[PDB]
Amino acid sequence: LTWHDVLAEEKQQPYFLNTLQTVASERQSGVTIYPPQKDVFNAFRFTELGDVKVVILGQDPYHGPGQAHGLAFSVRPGIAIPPSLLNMYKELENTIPGFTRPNHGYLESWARQGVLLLNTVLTVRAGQAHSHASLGWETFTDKVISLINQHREGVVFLLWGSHAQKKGAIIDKQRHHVLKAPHPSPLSAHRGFFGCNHFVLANQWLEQRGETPIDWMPVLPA
Template identity: 70%
Template sequence: MNQLPTWHDVIGEEKQQSYFVDTMKFVDAERAAGKAIYPPAKDVFNAFRFTEFNDVKVVILGQDPYHGPNQAHGLCFSVLPGIKTPPSLVNMYKELAQDIEGFQIPQHGFLQSWAVQGVLLLNTVLTVEQGKAHSHSKTGWETFTDRVIEAINQHQQGVVFLLWGAHAQKKGRFIDRNKHHVLTAPHPSPLSAHRGFFGSKPFSQANQILVQQGKEAINWHLPMTV
């Protein structure tokens, strides 16, 4: 049995690639020019810090980080404690309240307790300029996060991918559906949640799939305050 690689094995190789070096140079230059770039440099790779490669059970794929002050901290859909819960996450909480028995909607949007249980909260693009959505798309991040998904696809077994909206579904098109489980729905954004995100029961479905494989279910309940 081959030993599963760590993120260091997977990402370490990518960090030597010229496209990745260029991406980091671009982000560093933007910061050096005095632009507000989110999340802070120390938080850009938090998704990998809180969810080790071998522990990945569920992948939730986001687009790019929140672009308001103090929101983004490297986990998709999540915001730092003390920050108002953004609209898409409000809708995720509404679905959780319907989907997971006893789920209480918390007063915050901090999802780190999911990440440490094996929910990889991965954005497609890992940085953004303040107030400018998608400002860092096509700078190389998409290639990097494709490699991350490829590594999970290749080395892991039975991971549940929650792909919400056309962007995430396109990104996940090469996932091997014979090895992994892909659950799709419209995006939880207020623009599309009513088109089928509500009622899709992704959280209970993910747990059902994990339990069927003999894995431990995710505790989706969040502390009321952080």
């Protein structure tokens, strides 16, 4: 089963086609939009439906130049590690043996292992956070989640923050494994994120089902 097969009908909806249209019209009139158009759907390219093992939900892309590249939380090589990702690394340093702070924030190796890094809103206008909200993306990603719920079994969902947790109501908690915690953001990290053990719990779930664990140590492609 591929994304192509399940999303076939959705790509035909007027609303979805008009979301793409609005973005295209904005790019043409001189508005800078992130990520680049070719990267907008990278999460789907690197992690195929049948390969999904873990889903980590994000909000919208980074709005600074050279940051976002189509994956939630990840930034290109050479870009400073953002606060939330830095906190995620810290959680990894004191919960996983042999893990050491990577020195870059590029997470393609996670996606390649079955970790779907999905943002709920797929585009953003430069320097304007949450500027592409309520345009159609949420409706589309709601459907993506609903499809994983329906066509897969035993997937782990890491829902951080209240906004992401609400989106986790569509998920069948018996067929799938849902884990919740405060957002990794510095404002809330000390109220539950640090010590949530999500990365360990995630691997334990996979191990008991007879699946390979995730090597959370990010690697720069050579």
